RNA sequence: GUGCAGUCGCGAAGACAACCAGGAGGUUGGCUUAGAAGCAGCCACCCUUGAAAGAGUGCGUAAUAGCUCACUGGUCAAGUGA
RNA sequence: AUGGUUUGGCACCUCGAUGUCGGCUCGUCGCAUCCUGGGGCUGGAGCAGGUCCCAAGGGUUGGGCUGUUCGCCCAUUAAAGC
């Protein structure tokens, strides 16, 4: 661990958030590498799913276009990013969610808004 | 999850198979026939059949791809896996065989694709003792 | 056990245990070494036991040097005898080891096993000693 | 002599082919044969040591192919250590309990580099069965040098 | 490529002798003698802490600038008397230098890499003596042992010399021996 | 218990302490128990 | 053991410790034993989804499993470690 | 390294006298404990042990051989201490 790598991860989060469009943040619980890798290779040939921090993501947020959130990452963080649109992969994480139920789908930053019953759930499932 | 590269037609020795799954609590005679019935169409397999179970003690299993090490052996002619790579390259394994491994393991391996699977089995053989190129 | 093929004088005065070592104060042969901090006569048995201790703590791999040869005799009068009637005959072969003198040297990949082997050797040795490095 | 090793001559059967103690050419590698002046056909290998001095005698030579599978082997040895103090010198017998071996290149020396050098004979002349015995013979935990002898 | 000549204060020695030297070393200083083509040697008191920092951060053969009573004199570390036991610097022989001097030094050779598992590397030379200008003396002279089988006597002429440096040693000088 | 002047750890669980003026070594494995004496 | 003088690694971009969740496939990487696998024993000591996963930290292990690990993320919260 | 009991080294008091071995009697002390007592670990199931620690309160047999001390042996003993 190094603060140089902290700034590196902040820059990586900022630039990949700018490059890829959909960003589904998740609270990971009830996992296992053997199964998450297996499902991820299948559902993620156009996305990628991995960790985020509570403060490095906040720095990348202040330095990217997701500026004011600052309180969502109080908990485990296993963000995935879809470089097209999280519809197939969003449905994928939705079925994984209704399978395990330990994982929570925190939300995202599709465009301006963070999370609500209106857009994120329905664009994910349907 | 009793992970064992269970062998060909054999009378169930003690170390690898029988009590190996017995200590976890799976039956002793049904699994060999139930797996032979699936390897009829795939005659020739020493698959790492990770023996699995149901709620009330039933034989659940999804047949897996054969092992990369032992498939490399069966394809390299002499069924003998060495132990000293990087210093003595026993025999150069060929790309079509590496890709046949990749194709038969793309079903039931955690590889991304053909070339990722090839790199995975490359590391496998790199630890093993045999060339992969 | 080390021993010379010959000595011009078999019966010699005891080597003077004084002064800091002027030569062999550094490594010049390997990477890690044993430096002495006390004066002492180091013998064949001590040298061989320490060499062996190194060669057992670590095996094939690396090299060992012994920068001292015990070419200095030490006599012993017979037991149950009076003082006088001549000087005793040589019994022990030692090397006069002043402080600073590097005694054992080795080159081995892992500093951990090297230092531990040298520690085994030092515990075989009769003196307070020290690990030293070619680097500084 | 002429029962197992030698049945590969192209010209005509009948053999006085002997495997000179130069490189152990019994494995099916690029080899040739020199009509040994008084003593038959010394069969030698391409990467042999005393091959240039034989090619200096360039007339007394003849083609050979040498794939007579049902025969014996010349044999090759390996460098492996012992320890000499009450353990890991009887590991040679522990690991010879799983393999029988004839003496090739043994040598005991311990005022040396940091081991009781006990360069170990072997009875293994197979292409694809080397690392196996080299693992069986590698109990001492200080196995750094592993290459065979030529 | 150059090297920033490290800065140091150097009070001149008033009383010279073993008593003064020992009192200085107890005061944390270092006796030194600056000589060279200056041809009028100066007897100085460095500071042990910063002098040792300079040496351990820029090797022995280090350029350095000496605030000798205001004057900033350029010098090289020619030799060191270090105690065997304490390993404290007892004395520094320093060489006056200037721009484009082509001094001669004894630089630290450093092996690195890793050969075949079935071998061993023995350094026969702690150092290599070279000629170079006294602002581009390398802190180190590296050599590689990646992919070198036994029987590879790496000598001094086989080293990767930088620009301007010139071997004064012989190429026959064995540096590294790769053995079983 | 072992009572020796040289008491030291034997495994990673062996912890060293100074109890009642005596250097003790404690562990889950009571074989590794030691005391300075 | 304690004091002093340092030095180095890390650290509010949350460190070390604790508490919550996860902690691998390939794969048994190979030899060896009736076996060899994260762990009689040994050779090499890889790659891959990916944060993190060690040719596995150990236990448990007849081999396995289960157990917790190293490690990853979090909750509080600055000293912490060598 | 301890101890100072062995063989010794030194030759410091004692050669105008310091009587010697062994035994008998009388004891006294130390603990480096033979038994008894307390305890830790154990490759301690239990009986019985091994090893280490604490412990000197008391007890620690009678006989054959030998001048013998010592030792061997006989029977015993909780034990037959140094």
Swiss-Prot record, chain A:
| Any one Gene Ontology cellular component term annotated for this protein | large ribosomal subunit
Task: Name a GO molecular-function annotation.
Answer: structural constituent of ribosome
Q: Does the keyword RNA-binding apply?
A: yes
Give the top-rank taxon of the lineage listed in the UniProt record for this protein. Bacteria
Entry keyword Phosphoprotein: no
Q: Which GO BP terms, alphabetically? A: translation
Summary of the function given for this chain in its UniProt record: Forms part of the ribosomal stalk, playing a central role in the interaction of the ribosome with GTP-bound translation factors.
Whom does it interact with, and what assembly results?
Part of the ribosomal stalk of the 50S ribosomal subunit. The N-terminus interacts with L11 and the large rRNA to form the base of the stalk. The C-terminus forms an elongated spine to which L12 dimers bind in a sequential fashion forming a multimeric L10(L12)X complex.
Question: Which named protein is this?
Answer: Large ribosomal subunit protein uL10
Species source reads: Mycolicibacterium smegmatis (strain ATCC 700084 / mc(2)155) (Mycobacterium smegmatis)
| Complete-protein stretch covered | 1 to 126 of 175
From Swiss-Prot, chain B:
Q: Please provide, alphabetically and separated by semicolons, the GO molecular function terms listed in this UniProt record.
A: large ribosomal subunit rRNA binding; structural constituent of ribosome
A Pfam family assignment: Ribosomal_L11_N
Q: How is it modified after translation?
A: One or more lysine residues are methylated.
Q: Which GO terms describe its cellular component?
A: cytosolic large ribosomal subunit
Matching entries from Gene3D superfamilies are given as: Ribosomal protein L11, C-terminal domain (1.10.10.250), Ribosomal protein L11/L12, N-terminal domain (3.30.1550.10)
List keywords of the entry alphabetically.
Answer: Isopeptide bond, Methylation, Ribonucleoprotein, Ribosomal protein, RNA-binding, rRNA-binding, Ubl conjugation
Instruction: Return the InterPro entries for the record.
Output: Ribosomal_uL11 (IPR000911), Ribosomal_uL11_bac-typ (IPR006519), Ribosomal_uL11_C (IPR020783), Ribosomal_uL11_C_sf (IPR036769), Ribosomal_uL11_CS (IPR020785), Ribosomal_uL11_N (IPR020784), Ribosomal_uL11_N_sf (IPR036796)
Q: Which SMART domains match?
A: RL11 (SM00649)
Q: Which residues form a coiled coil?
A: none
Annotated GO biological process: translation
Covalent link location (Isoglutamyl lysine isopeptide (Lys-Gln) (interchain with Q-Cter in protein Pup)): 92
Name the job this protein performs.
Answer: Forms part of the ribosomal stalk which helps the ribosome interact with GTP-bound translation factors.
Q: Which HAMAP family match?
A: Ribosomal_uL11
How is this protein organized at the quaternary level? Part of the ribosomal stalk of the 50S ribosomal subunit. Interacts with L10 and the large rRNA to form the base of the stalk. L10 forms an elongated spine to which L12 dimers bind in a sequential fashion forming a multimeric L10(L12)X complex.
Q: Which family is this sequence assigned to?
A: Belongs to the universal ribosomal protein uL11 family.
Name this polypeptide is given = Large ribosomal subunit protein uL11
Curated annotation (Swiss-Prot), chain C:
One MF term in the entry's GO annotations:
tRNA binding
Task: Tell me yes or no: is Ribonucleoprotein among this UniProt entry's keywords.
Answer: yes
Q: Where is the composition biased (Basic residues)?
A: 1-13
Q: Where is this region: Disordered?
A: 1-24
Record key words, sorted: Ribonucleoprotein, Ribosomal protein, RNA-binding, rRNA-binding, tRNA-binding
Q: How does it assemble?
A: Part of the 50S ribosomal subunit.
What does this protein's UniProt record list under function? Binds 23S rRNA and is also seen to make contacts with the A and possibly P site tRNAs.
Q: Which family does it belong to?
A: Belongs to the universal ribosomal protein uL16 family.
Protein name per the record: Large ribosomal subunit protein uL16
Q: Which organism is it from?
A: Mycolicibacterium smegmatis (strain ATCC 700084 / mc(2)155)
Encoding gene, per UniProt annotation: rplP
Curated annotation (Swiss-Prot), chain F:
Q: Name one GO biological process term.
A: translation
UniProt GO molecular function: structural constituent of ribosome
Q: Which PROSITE patterns match?
A: RIBOSOMAL_L36
Spell out the GO cellular component terms annotated for this protein, sorted alphabetically and separated by semicolons.
cytoplasm; ribonucleoprotein complex; ribosome
Q: Which UniProt keywords apply?
A: Ribonucleoprotein, Ribosomal protein
Key word Protease present in the record?
no
Q: Which family does it belong to?
A: Belongs to the bacterial ribosomal protein bL36 family.
Protein name as annotated: Large ribosomal subunit protein bL36
From what organism does this protein derive?
Answer: Mycolicibacterium smegmatis (strain ATCC 700084 / mc(2)155)
**Gene name as annotated:** rpmJ
């Amino acid at each position: 661990m190094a603060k140089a790598d902290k700034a590196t991860a902040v820059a990586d989060i900022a630039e990949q958030f700018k490059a890829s469009t959909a960003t589904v943040v998740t609270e990971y619980r009830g996992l296992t590498v053997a199964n998450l890798a297996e499902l991820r290779r299948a559902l993620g040939d156009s996305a990628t799913y991995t960790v985020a921090k509570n403060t490095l993501v906040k720095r990348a947020a202040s330095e990217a276009g997701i500026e004011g959130l600052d309180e969502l990452f109080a908990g485990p963080t296993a963000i995935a990013f879809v470089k097209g649109e999280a519809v197939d992969a969003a449905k994928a994480i939705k079925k994984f969610a209704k399978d395990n139920k330990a994982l929570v789908i925190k939300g995202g930053y599709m465009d301006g808004k963070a999370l609500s019953v209106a857009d994120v759930e329905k664009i994910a499932d349907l | 999850l009793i992970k064992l590269q269970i062998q060909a037609g054999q009378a169930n020795p003690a170390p690898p198979v029988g009590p190996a799954l017995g200590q976890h609590g799976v039956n002793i005679m049904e699994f060999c026939k139930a797996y032979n019935a699936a390897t009829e169409s795939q005659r020739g397999n020493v698959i790492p059949v990770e023996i699995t179970v149901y709620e009330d003690r039933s034989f659940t299993f999804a047949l897996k791809t054969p092992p990369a090490a032992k498939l490399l052996l069966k394809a390299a002619g002499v069924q003998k896996g060495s132990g000293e790579p990087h210093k003595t390259k026993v025999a150069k394994v060929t790309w079509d065989q590496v890709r046949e491994i990749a194709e038969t393991k793309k079903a039931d391996l955690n590889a991304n694709d053909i070339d990722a699977a090839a790199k995975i089995i490359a590391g496998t053989a790199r630890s093993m003792g045999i060339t992969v190129e | 056990m080390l021993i010379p093929r010959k000595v011009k004088h078999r019966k010699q005065h005891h080597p003077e245990q004084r002064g800091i070592a002027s030569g062999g104060t550094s490594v010049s042969f390997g990477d890690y070494g044993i430096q002495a901090l006390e004066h002492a006569y180091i013998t064949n048995r001590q040298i061989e036991s320490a060499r062996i201790a190194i060669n057992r703590h670590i095996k094939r791999g690396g090299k060992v040097w012994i920068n001292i040869f015990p070419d200095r005799p030490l006599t012993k009068k017979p037991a149950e005898t009076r003082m006088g009637s001549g000087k005793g005959s040589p019994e022990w072969w030692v090397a006069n080891v002043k402080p600073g003198r590097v005694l054992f040297e080795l080159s081995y990949p892992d500093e951990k096993t090297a230092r531990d082997a040298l520690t085994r050797a030092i515990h075989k040795l009769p003196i307070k000693a020290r690990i030293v490095t070619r680097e500084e | 002599s002429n029962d197992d090793t030698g049945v590969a001559v192209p010209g005509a059967p009948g053999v006085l082919t002997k495997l000179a103690k130069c490189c152990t050419p019994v494995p099916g590698d690029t080899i040739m044969g020199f009509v040994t002046r008084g003593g038959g056909v010394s069969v030698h290998r391409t990467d042999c040591t005393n091959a240039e001095s034989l090619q200096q005698q360039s007339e007394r030579i003849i083609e050979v192919n040498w794939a007579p599978s049902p025969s014996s082997v010349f044999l090759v040895a390996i460098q492996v250590e012992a320890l000499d103090r009450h353990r890991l010198l009887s590991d040679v017998t522990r690991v010879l309990a799983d393999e029988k071996v004839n003496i090739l290149s043994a040598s005991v020396t311990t005022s040396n580099d940091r081991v009781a050098i006990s360069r170990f004979t072997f009875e293994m002349g197979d292409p694809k069965h080397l690392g196996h015995l080299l693992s069986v013979v590698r109990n001492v935990e200080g196995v750094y040098d592993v290459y065979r002898v030529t | 490529t150059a090297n920033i000549p490290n800065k140091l204060t150097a009070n001149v020695r008033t009383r010279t002798g073993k008593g003064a030297s020992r009192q200085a070393r107890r005061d944390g200083k270092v006796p030194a003698v600056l000589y060279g083509h200056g041809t009028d040697p100066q007897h100085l008191e460095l500071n042990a802490r910063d002098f040792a920092a300079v040496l351990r951060s820029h090797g022995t053969n280090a350029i350095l600038t000496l605030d000798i009573e205001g004057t900033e004199q350029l010098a090289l570390t020619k030799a060191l008397d270090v105690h065997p036991i304490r390993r404290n610097i007892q004395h520094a022989d320093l060489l006056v230098v200037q721009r484009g001097e082509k001094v001669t030094v004894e630089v630290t050779v450093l092996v690195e890499g890793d050969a075949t598992p079935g071998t061993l590397v023995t350094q026969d030379a702690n150092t290599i003596e070279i000629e170079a200008e006294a602002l581009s003396i390398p802190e180190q002279l590296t050599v590689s042992v990646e992919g070198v089988e036994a029987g590879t006597q790496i000598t001094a002429g086989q080293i990767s010399l930088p620009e301007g440096v010139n071997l004064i040693s012989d190429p026959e000088l064995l540096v590294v021996n790769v053995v079983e | 218990m072992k009572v020796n002047p040289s008491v030291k750890p034997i495994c990673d669980k062996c912890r060293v302490i100074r109890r009642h003026g005596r250097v003790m070594v404690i562990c889950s494995d009571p074989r590794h128990k030691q005391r300075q004496g």
